[PDB]
Design a protein around this nucleic acid. Sequence first.
DNA 1: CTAGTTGATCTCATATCAGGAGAAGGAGCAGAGCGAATAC
RNA 2: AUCGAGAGGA
DNA 3: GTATTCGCTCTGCTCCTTCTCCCATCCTCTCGATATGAGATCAACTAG
Lengths: 534, 51, 41
Amino acid sequence: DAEFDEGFKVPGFLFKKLFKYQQTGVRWLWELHCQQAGGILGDEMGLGKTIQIIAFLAGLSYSKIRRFEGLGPTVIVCPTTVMHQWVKEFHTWWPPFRVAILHETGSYTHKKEKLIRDVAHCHGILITSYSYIRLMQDDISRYDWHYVILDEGHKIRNPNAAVTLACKQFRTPHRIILSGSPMQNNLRELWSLFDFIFPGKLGTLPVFMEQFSVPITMGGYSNASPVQVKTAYKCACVLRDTINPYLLRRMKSDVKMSLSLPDKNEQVLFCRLTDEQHKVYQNFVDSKEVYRILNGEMQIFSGLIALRKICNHPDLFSGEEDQFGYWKRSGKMIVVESLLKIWHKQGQRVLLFSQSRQMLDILEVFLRAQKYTYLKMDGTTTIASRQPLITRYNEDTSIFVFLLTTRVGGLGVNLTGANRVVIYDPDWNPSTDTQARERAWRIGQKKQVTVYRLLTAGTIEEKIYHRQIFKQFLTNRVLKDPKQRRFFKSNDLYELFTLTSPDASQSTETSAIFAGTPLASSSLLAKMRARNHL
Amino acid sequence: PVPPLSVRPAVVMQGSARNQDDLTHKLADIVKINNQLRRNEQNGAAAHVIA
Amino acid sequence: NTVYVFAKKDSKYAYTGECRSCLENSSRPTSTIWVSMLARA
DNA sequence: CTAGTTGATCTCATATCAGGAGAAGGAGCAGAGCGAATAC
RNA sequence: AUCGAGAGGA
DNA sequence: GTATTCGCTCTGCTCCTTCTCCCATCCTCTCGATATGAGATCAACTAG
């Protein structure tokens, strides 16, 4: 059996099964357990983070380290769609853990409070949903939990949500987060996650923002004064080394040689607005509503929703060959016509993504107007019948296009039989579109998958994509390397109520922006003066 | 104590714009600052900021 | 710009003179100076 | 019993001078009155 | 309709 | 052993300061200013 420095006898017949990065992760988790601190397994999806957690907890139970003779009661807060998976994983790796699910489905068939009491009384392994943490936040937190594992802990990304407060009401030193991305939009989410795992390490959120978030974003613009970008680099370095020993994040660059990965290509099509759609958009951006938005007298949010609706299709905003949702009145639907026809002639299989469920229904009606066989899964479908549809799409070839919104289903529902994917409209979060493209291109994908993002040039959608890239750049700067070539302008990125459609004489805004493509008190002093000159 | 709607009627106007009463606006102010203060006292907030 | 001396019966001054001085070209509002007399070494 | 459909409801997320009068408190001084404290 | 303002009447 | 003071306290007395309140009734007219959907939960079905 493998043995660590202080003595943590992870069993040989489990430890041998792990991969090198998995064993490194178990080492890191147990270093945290010795320091009595929490962490974030920020390894991206597909590497396997549940295996690391069960291996580490099993070693902690067999090693009988101690308070508690070995491992005590632990709570795992995960989305419903994976709860049963978790128990099966335990039951196949380490059987003697009395694992139990808290759910209406469940297995207890009695009062749930009795389940919490009984499981804690046996030092069991208890799995919940985030909603049960929120609802029983006073009840579930009375039985001296030894570990808290927030699987997909990006549910805590908001420092305001009641789930965040209910999850931060736990008392143990041991807080582990299993999230594919600690931050998705901005540094609010990084702060919230670190306030969970380690209450004191990063400062109070005001302090954190005023020190890190504002300088970094101010240095994320290409029109920033040199002092601003240098301060942003320095502050990013400080945040990086502050979070270094508590965020274990591994990419698919170092671990790529261990597992295969088919090549992925991606294009961003810029779909010109149709003349009627262009007229409607120009009338809205000239109407008094956007003027009141610019005055601040009305919520800008409704104007955003309206312009997104216009760029999707005029029939959304406005409300034979003239029925609801005719595909000839929006240029993005023209390109979807061309791509769907060509891909059907190629015999491939398509994922059709869109943030709007109404335009998802419009796309359904369009597909019915054509003769493409298809299958739909969205939020309106019952969850108990979600797994069949996916399976029926993945097993046969007699279904051509599968319809999604970016945010339906559990994280990473296995849509492997698809070959091509089209994202009909961009979202504000880079992570939801990254998840959309990732869902088709996962482990065990047989053929080269390509993603086509559909944009309308010079419109709100182009600015949504620009914001998405900007947030992605911020996340990358924080998480992998601070030095980064600056792409954007502060005023152009934030002003998003104009219409400059290209005439093909001049290039599009995105291509114009992307036009180029003990210490001995002297090392200590050298590092201090180095950081200070920046 | 929030009073009922009859103490602070929302009178309708020549069109559809429903004008609220001064008490309703003031309760809006109290509610917003109460919620905001609540999230500060719940979280870590400077003693002078809480004050 | 005129000195006016009044006497308030109920006050801590027997006599108080004031001038609301104001530069002729209206560069500024009138600024008032008071020269008082403390009430009744 | 027992799963599938239908509505309501909640959360969450998407950007960019020409008053006056009276009552309540606090302030500073003034003294009265009694305990101790030298002292003849 | 509400609010305020102003001008008036006895 | 009693003078005699004497320090210290206990009101208490004016006074100045603050502050809060009030300022006829009723009536007429004019005039200006003043979001949307996806997902989850639950509960009623709505039938098998």
